[PDB]
Design a protein around this nucleic acid. Structure first.
Lengths: 83, 81
RNA sequence: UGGUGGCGAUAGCGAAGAGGUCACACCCGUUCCCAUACCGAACACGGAAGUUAAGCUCUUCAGCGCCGAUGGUAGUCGGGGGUUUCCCCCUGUGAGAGUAGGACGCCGCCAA
RNA sequence: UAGGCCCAGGCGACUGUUUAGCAAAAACACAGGUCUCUGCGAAGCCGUAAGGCGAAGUAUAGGGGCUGACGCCUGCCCGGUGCUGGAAGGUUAAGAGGAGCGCUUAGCGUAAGCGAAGGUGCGAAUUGAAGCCCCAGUAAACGGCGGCCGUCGGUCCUAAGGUAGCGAAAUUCCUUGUCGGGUAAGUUCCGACCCGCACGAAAGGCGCAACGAUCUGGGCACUGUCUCAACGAGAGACUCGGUGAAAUUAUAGUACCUGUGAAGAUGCAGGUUACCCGCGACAGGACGGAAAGACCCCGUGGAGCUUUACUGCAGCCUGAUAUUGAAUGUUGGUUUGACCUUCUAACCCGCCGCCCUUAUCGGGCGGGGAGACAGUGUCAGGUGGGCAGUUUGACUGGGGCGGUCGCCUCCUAAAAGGUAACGGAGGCGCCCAAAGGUUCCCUCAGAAUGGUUGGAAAUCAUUCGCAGAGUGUAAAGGCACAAGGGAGCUUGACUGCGAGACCUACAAGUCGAGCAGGGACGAAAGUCGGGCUUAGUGAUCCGGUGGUUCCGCAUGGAAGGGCCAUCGCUCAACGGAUAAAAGCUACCCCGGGGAUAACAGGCUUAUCUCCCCCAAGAGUCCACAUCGACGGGGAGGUUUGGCACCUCGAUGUCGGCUCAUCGCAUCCUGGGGCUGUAGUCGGUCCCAAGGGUUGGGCUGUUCGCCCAUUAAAGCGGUA
RNA sequence: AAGCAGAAGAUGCGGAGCCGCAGCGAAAGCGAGUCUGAAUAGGGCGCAUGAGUACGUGGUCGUAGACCCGAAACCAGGUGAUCUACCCAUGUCCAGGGUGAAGUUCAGGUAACACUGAAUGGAGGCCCGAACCCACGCACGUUGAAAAGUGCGGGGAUGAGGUGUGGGUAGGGGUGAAAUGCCAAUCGAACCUGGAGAUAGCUGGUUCUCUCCGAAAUAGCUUUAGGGCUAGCCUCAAGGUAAGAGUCUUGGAGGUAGAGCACUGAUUGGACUAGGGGCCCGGGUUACCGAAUUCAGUCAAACUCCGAAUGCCAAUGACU
RNA sequence: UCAUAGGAUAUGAGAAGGCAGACCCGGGGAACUGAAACAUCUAAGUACCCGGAGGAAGAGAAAGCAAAUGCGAUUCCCUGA
RNA sequence: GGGGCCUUAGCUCAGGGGAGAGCGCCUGCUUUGCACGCAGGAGGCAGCGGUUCGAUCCCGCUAGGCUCCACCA
């Protein structure tokens, strides 16, 4: 689906607005490629992210929209953290 | 001017030509039908038979007569010479 | 009496009574035939100790239901007329409802 | 004879160009800007090709697209479509291929049948480019730039949600928006405001001096534009002489009132009026003349145009093959072909020199350059409105849009049957392998009692209980001796048929005793050719499958066909035009229509206007001075309308000017009643239509608002 | 028949061929039978109930322009750029007047410049305005003087200028400062000829008389609705022949009018009342609401316990 | 360089072009229309254009018709139909 | 006015067999800790009718809203 929607449902980011904001800043990327909130995603995707200096690498397992709270984190897995 | 429509009550089935087809006292051949119907407004009687379409036919030649099954119930019959 | 058929419940519903030695029933038990989605209630099998209570027949009645006139009226073919979303006149026909009243059965065949 | 001027605004920078013969413009062009293409045989374009423009030029050039001087600027989105590039992978042609399969047959064979080789037909794997799928980039490319909730925040979605600037605009319906200016008065104009129905940045945004026979508003001057006309000159008109047409025309000795009538009469009816013939003038009528209505509709009519309508074509791209051969390697299975490099002699040169030859053609020689490529031919795939041929339904209370299109049930339907409407209500495009057949069995729903969990409502016994239930499904008809509900056994949900009937334009559809064969259930009679009856489905052609004592082009086979059974279509617009199909026309055209629409007329009068009835109630009290609720009844034929009767071989349609005319439901004037009439002024009602019933601003306007007057500033009809 | 002979003839010859006499079946094939079928069954088609053939007249149909005229349009082949659009080559016309640029010089001015004022100079898709060209505004004309003009004014008027001559571009095209405009008084695709008597479910027209009979304007299906097909209705002829029709009588089916509430629905009022309140001590009252039941009452196209008149279908005979 | 191209000269009743708007042989090759629309199909290998002719052209002596104790070039007519 | 879509907790959503997922505002609590919370405001199929044992889920009628259309003289 879309990146911002994915982040909200997976509860990485609490607001789709904030997801859009960070993607427009380009702090993050996908598969080594800079990306945008409208960027398409899917299972198997490898996602690079930044939180200030905290850089993160994760892996996409699933995607949906109803996404209750604890079932959110099932959608993906962490892989690695750098800074 | 205005604009309207949507009657949605504009059909009906093809008329099926029920009722009696032969008359009392009328001579009849074998196999002739007598009274198309649905269900039994009328039953058969002597030398008369019913079909899968609840239709009444003469098994023989003869003359037709309509009668009543006692109360509030009718009948036909063929009587030969 | 019993069996068995026919006729639109004018046959029925309901209330009251009478009878069963024969007959019909109720009734006594399942070992067999057979059976009971459960079982001898029923169906089958055999029996006859006792019971006319029921069923079944015979009487009564008109409370319910049923049948049903005559007359009148509506309606109406036809003809004619009129102030004609309707009405009226004439020959003829003619209900329903409501009554009068009828009726708690008529006819047969077999067996003792 | 040779400018009228000024203030302000919109549009376009300007000078220019344009619809010869309606439109001069805000349109076109323009210089300027920007994007893109193109390395020179350019590219593009014309042409079948040669040959050409481009250009006797060479990226500061040429072509194409968009925008339009100048000034400040030209924001966000590349998700989609385009282009550009990539392109590991998938898919995809023709060609190559050539495992196998059929047919045939020598031979083997008692027969059945098997059957080598050859021929023939079909042929799998494998290979097979571009393209497409896919990934990036690009917006002065196509193009796009949102919503909800809350009192700036929160949220949904987006590829992104409109930045600056401007804004009731050439865009603003509501709307004459609000305010202010200007004016006595300003739907116009100007300036501002902005909740921008529906501005917006090269379809460019905003501004802008100069320019404009541009559009718009205001002002000075001037004027017969007007108040409100008057006079004069000249040419026609008029008379006389000379000459002398045309359109049109059924014949005509051609009156008006009302009425009728194909609904608007000269000619018809009734009544009124009118001596006969001309001249000059007017133009109300002859639904006048002219032009087979240009609007509307129809035509299985046409033409032009568009496109992600259908089918095709050109053109372009790509591949195989022939021209098109010599090598060195490479990898494959069997020598072979494929691939990369190289060479040259093929082929090519809008390169040079010489000769033909005084020749920028060509054509021979020599060189040179490229090179088995290209080009061309054949075949194949893709793209392809550049182009062509065509389609694009009907009904319809005009058409279009909407809705519907076949079948079943009921009502309408008028007591046989049948019977329409864009009349009223509902259903079908199935289901059951038991929900069928047969044999045997028994009888429902609800109510009252009692009774754990049990409860209002399970299940329970219980009496009442034609039937209130059920009947696979919608409804009607019908069924309780079951057609309803159970159990057992089974598959007649059979084959061949079918007297004779029903319905019927046809096609078709429906019922059917009874016969034969073989069965099922039942002891037997006997029932069973689907279901409780009525819907549950579609032609033909074309193909496919199976079977067949049919035919099989000399003969034997075969191919193929026929017969039988059967499958494939929402062909649903359901008697189906094709296997294959959407739109615009205001640039339009033809044939017809008043069979059909817009104006007017006509019928109706729902609506509209007006009048009236009851009278509660208001009216301090009091219904009726004046108002009059809930309700009711009429008139008129000025409204909006309904119907389609005349008119489509033409009835010109708003408003205004001139000219008037009629009605009265009277605005004024006149005469009266009542009064919640002191007077003056008034209200309301009655009789009265004789006469009169203003000038301006705004708007095309009618209407309406406003200013100032007036006795009053009437309502309507007359196409 | 062709054909030979025969005066363009009649005729003769010419029997190859055609129709019929036997049909049935898809066909092999069989045969007054045949096909289906397992069937000597039944059924279909046929025979038994037989007349065709050749020619002619007449009616109708089919194919050909097929009753006549009539399109817009389509295709092929040609003619046209003496008009007009654009282009090429060569020539030619634009009275007069005005403005006053660049540059140059001088002077001021500046370090120099810049800058400033005069003179010269003579530019400009510059100005005014005749010829010339174009056509906005009005009027007139509108069977005109004129198939686009005249009069009064108007715009441009040394530049994208006007104009002549000679040439080029030709229609599935050309040209176009683009309007779909022009291409010989025409143009959303020129004109002539031919295909071609295009087609026309459309309109109009269709010529002497008399007599007999005498309609329809309905159904069904239709890319069908103003057309067509079949049926219905008319006519003519040959047959059957007396069946047909009307009335009377008799018997039937049919559930409409009407009427009614027994069903389904709608509905009025009353009585009682489950129950639920409000009032007093699990009760005890209340007319506070009130289920069902009941009494009586009204109504129905899609409701009937009932049910006509008329009409419809038949039979018997009678009369006509 | 032979040599060739090319050039020069002489002979040729050569052939050119026309037609009769008809007949025929071929190369090219429509649309209207009909199909009640329409594209396959028809119209139609017509019209039209072009090139060749001759009085005729074209075809023509079997790599045939066929299926019998077989016919013997083409063409045309009647039949087959 | 016609057609289509929608009308479920405060907001956004799913779901013929019993309406439940997330989010937010205000208040209160709360605390050692790098915005990591909790409870209440409160969680209710626009309405009406019908079929079914049942309806948000099928059907029908009506209302509210959004979009499209409301043309030819």
């Amino acid at each position: 689906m879309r990146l911002d929607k994915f982040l909200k449902v997976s509860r990485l980011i609490k607001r789709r607005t904030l997801a859009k904001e960070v993607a427009d800043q380009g702090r993050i990327s996908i598969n080594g490629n800079q990306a945008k909130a409208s960027s398409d995603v899917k299972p198997g995707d490898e996602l690079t992210v930044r939180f200030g200096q905290k850089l993160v690498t994760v892996q996409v397992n699933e995607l949906k929209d109803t996404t209750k709270k604890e079932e959110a984190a099932n959608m993906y897995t962490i892989l690695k953290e750098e800074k | 001017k205005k604009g309207v429509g949507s009657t949605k009550n504009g059909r009906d089935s093809e008329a099926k030509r029920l009722g009696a087809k032969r008359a009392d006292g009328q001579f009849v051949t074998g196999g002739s039908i007598l009274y198309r119907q649905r269900g039994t407004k009328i039953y058969p009687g002597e030398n008369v038979g019913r079909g899968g379409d609840d239709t009444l036919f003469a098994k023989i030649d003869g003359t037709v007569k309509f009668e009543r099954f006692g109360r509030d119930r009718k009948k036909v019959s063929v009587y030969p010479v």
